[PDB]
């Protein structure tokens, strides 16, 4: 009956070649844990650790091995063909590089929005002629507003975003933004 939990390691956003592990946890004991893609005929079968913990090892993933995965569990007792409520879809992204963000000045301090289209990324902002990152924050939301002080603000700037932990996936650097005097 009630739906299980499906999570991924070491991250839900990975570069290609990374070994991914899907872990499904049932809120009650089960015999089988099916992995459900959209586009597949029959589900694929997790490997049981316990009656409430199963694992699916994704060996050295590829881009097409990304998409929307769901987990359902079942007992033989329920009868043929019937599964639990499907787990929330775990969205797995496999890319070598992430879509580049935009860097823009927003509507005397000055704020700069580096914006991508992906959540839970770390956003970094660079000034030209300055090696180390100027600023960076983690953002749940797919954008980061960097505030600059008016009197040290003019200069050239770029940004990129990236996942928070290794194995890193990095966005292509954004186009350059110039702040004039």
């Amino acid at each position: 009956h009630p739906k299980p939990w499906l999570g991924a390691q070491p991250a839900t956003v990975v570069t290609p070649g990374v070994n991914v592990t899907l872990r499904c946890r049932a809120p009650q004991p089960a015999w089988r844990f099916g992995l459900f893609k959209p586009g597949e005929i029959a589900p694929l079968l997790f490997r049981d650790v316990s009656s409430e913990l199963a694992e699916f090892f994704l060996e050295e993933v590829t881009p097409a091995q990304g998409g929307s995965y769901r987990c359902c569990y079942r007992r033989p007792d329920w009868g043929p063909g019937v599964w639990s409520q499907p787990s929330d879809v775990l969205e797995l992204l496999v890319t070598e590089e992430l879509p580049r963000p935009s860097l823009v000045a927003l509507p005397a301090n000055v704020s700069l929005r580096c914006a991508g289209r992906l959540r839970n990324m770390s956003f970094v902002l660079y000034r030209e002629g300055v090696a180390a990152p100027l600023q960076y924050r983690h953002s749940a939301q797919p954008w980061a507003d960097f505030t600059l002080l008016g009197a040290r603000a003019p200069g050239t700037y770029s940004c990129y975003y990236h996942t928070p932990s290794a194995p890193y996936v990095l966005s292509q650097r954004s186009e350059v933004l110039v702040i004039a005097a």
Binding site: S122, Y126, E128, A131, P133, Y136, S158, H162, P164, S165
Partner: peptide, 20 residues
Amino acid sequence: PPGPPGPPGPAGFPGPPGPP
């Protein structure tokens, strides 16, 4: 409890000079 990942590395060296 391991410390946080170090800061993002520096941006790459500036490009090669533009062509004719």
